[PDB]
Amino acid sequence: GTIYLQHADEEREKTYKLAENIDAQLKRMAQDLKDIIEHLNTSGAPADTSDP
Amino acid sequence: NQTTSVAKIAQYKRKLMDLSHRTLQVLIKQEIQRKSGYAIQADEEQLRVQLDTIQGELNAPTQFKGRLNELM
Amino acid sequence: LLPPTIYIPYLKMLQGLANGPQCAHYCFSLLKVNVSWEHFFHSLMLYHEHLRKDLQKEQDGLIAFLQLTSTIITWSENARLALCETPVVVILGLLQCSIPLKAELLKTLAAFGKSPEIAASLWQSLEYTILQTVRIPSGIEVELNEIESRCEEYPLTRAFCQLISTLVESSFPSNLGAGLRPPGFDPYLQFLRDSVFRFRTRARA
Fold it and tell me: Which compartments is it annotated to reside in (chain C)?
């Protein structure tokens, strides 16, 4: 609120906003990769998953 | 106690990661609002060089496309 | 007597001698005519370079140098301009350096400040000397920061106030700070918010 009662503008902030999304994004991706691996594992022998 | 207590450990861990994201986000906004000031550069660009690299690396091209979904 | 310590006490002793408006005048002439004022500023200039290039004995010498210049400049007349133009440029340069001293040069600078229009060199020095490092966003706080960064310690502030009191007495340049920042005198007053807001919570009455 304080900063708003100032001259104006905000800046060089975007870069960080990019950094967090950038850092965040791969986290997105790890999940997807996890979501793949499980599927691959799932594709594997039938009639009894519960066997030894 | 142990088998259904895994719940707390997993829950705790996720909470940790979300708090980490907020920690980082609050950490980041304390460096845009106090910090411009429009001072900011020096070390910053180096951060910024690292970040640039990693980011469109990723992008682009290459990776995404091809790979993820030749696989899916 | 050249020995640094003798030299500094010599400066102090003379300050004491400078007392009357009349005596002050003689002290002015002593250096000017029959050690010269120029040598004195030179010493200050040299110390300045040594200090910055590098980045108690000196404090003794410098403190004395300033004590003396202050005493005379205060008790003088048209002469003030002459000393002003010359220590003004050098004193300004010294202020940029950290120094313990900052306040003291500000006090001396103030003595130099003249009553008339020819304040302008002084205002520019001050604005330039707050503005230079600071990065100002378009808000108010960034401006306060410029002052706070530079005027770190108590002596620095008191000196600053004396200089400002003098310059503000009756005048300043239009569109001050033009080029670098939002112009005008206003940010200085904001700074006082930092000061007399704080004052209530001094140390030390």
Answer: Nucleus membrane; Nucleus, Nuclear pore complex
